[PDB]
């Protein structure tokens, strides 16, 4: 705290309470007693625990029928109108779309829709596999996920 | 028909004014004006000028006969206290309070 390290009054003689610093955390415009620092909240997860979790929730999405597998999922031109038409034809609104390739027209056509997210098979995460209502996997993306996860 | 007049921020203490205001509570206004006329306090000047304003407001704005009017409610509230520093001996300071008031006079026929 910006201040001076001078006693605001002497120790005794006056009728007031003892005080040593105006920066005291009991004063107005004093310091914080346990003032915070920038800290890293990242936790370690073991690798086998991460894969155990993914194998658990992918098994659960199967048991809950929240997993849809298709051979191919492409949009011709990078248009969100085409993607929304295709998902309406699939009867899908809140969906994660995993593709074993890098499809740029699909990324661009899915960038404006907040109900829809498009990932690579490498870039899958458990919280997104849960936060989305349906998950559409290309069969190639299945082959890559099964290979990564043994 | 009740008619209100207020002298807000009256430069006087409420305790000093309530002594005067208690003399004319429930009285006819001709009697209250004679009491305040022959009361020697400063608060009598204040509360008389307020009663005169309430009478004229009741007559002008509400169409009321002066002889039937009667002081139904009167009360003095504490105002803002401006505060001053008065120096004392041995370098010691005292903060005096310079009290104010809110005089309110309600007059009616009832």
């Amino acid at each position: 705290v910006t201040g001076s390290g001078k006693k605001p009054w002497r120790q005794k003689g006056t009728g007031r309470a003892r005080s040593g610093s105006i920066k005291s955390p009991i004063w107005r415009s004093g310091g914080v007693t346990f003032a915070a620092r920038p800290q890293d909240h990242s936790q370690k997860v073991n690798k086998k625990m991460y894969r155990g979790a993914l194998k658990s929730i992918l098994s659960e999405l199967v048991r809950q029928d929240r997993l849809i597998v298709v051979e191919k999922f492409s949009v011709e031109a990078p248009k969100t109108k085409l993607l929304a038409q295709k998902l309406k034809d699939m009867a899908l609104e809140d969906v994660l779309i995993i593709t074993g390739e890098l499809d740029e027209n699909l990324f661009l056509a899915a960038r404006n829709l907040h109900k829809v997210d498009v990932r690579d098979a490498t870039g899958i995460d458990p919280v997104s596999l849960i936060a989305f209502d349906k998950v559409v996997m290309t069969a190639d993306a299945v082959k890559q996920v099964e290979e990564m996860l043994a | 028909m009740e008619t209100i007049a207020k002298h807000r921020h009256a430069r006087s203490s409420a305790q000093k004014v309530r002594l005067v205001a208690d003399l004319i509570r429930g009285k006819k206004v001709s009697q209250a004006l004679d009491i305040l006329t022959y009361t020697n306090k400063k608060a009598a000047v204040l509360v008389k000028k307020v009663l005169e304003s309430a009478i004229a407001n009741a007559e002008h704005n509400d169409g009321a006969d002066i002889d039937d009017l009667k002081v139904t409610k009167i009360f003095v509230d504490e105002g803002p206290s401006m505060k001053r520093i008065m120096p004392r001996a041995k370098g010691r300071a005292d903060r005096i309070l310079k009290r104010t008031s809110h005089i309110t006079v309600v007059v009616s026929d009832r």
């Binding site: 003689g13 006056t14 | 520093i85 041995k90 370098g91 010691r92 300071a93």
Partner: peptide
Amino acid sequence: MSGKMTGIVKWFNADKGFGFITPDDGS
């Protein structure tokens, strides 16, 4: 005025008090 209050506190204690007023050492 709490700045004229600054004076008040800053030096109605810096007046320092004179002292005890009974020549008594309870000795």
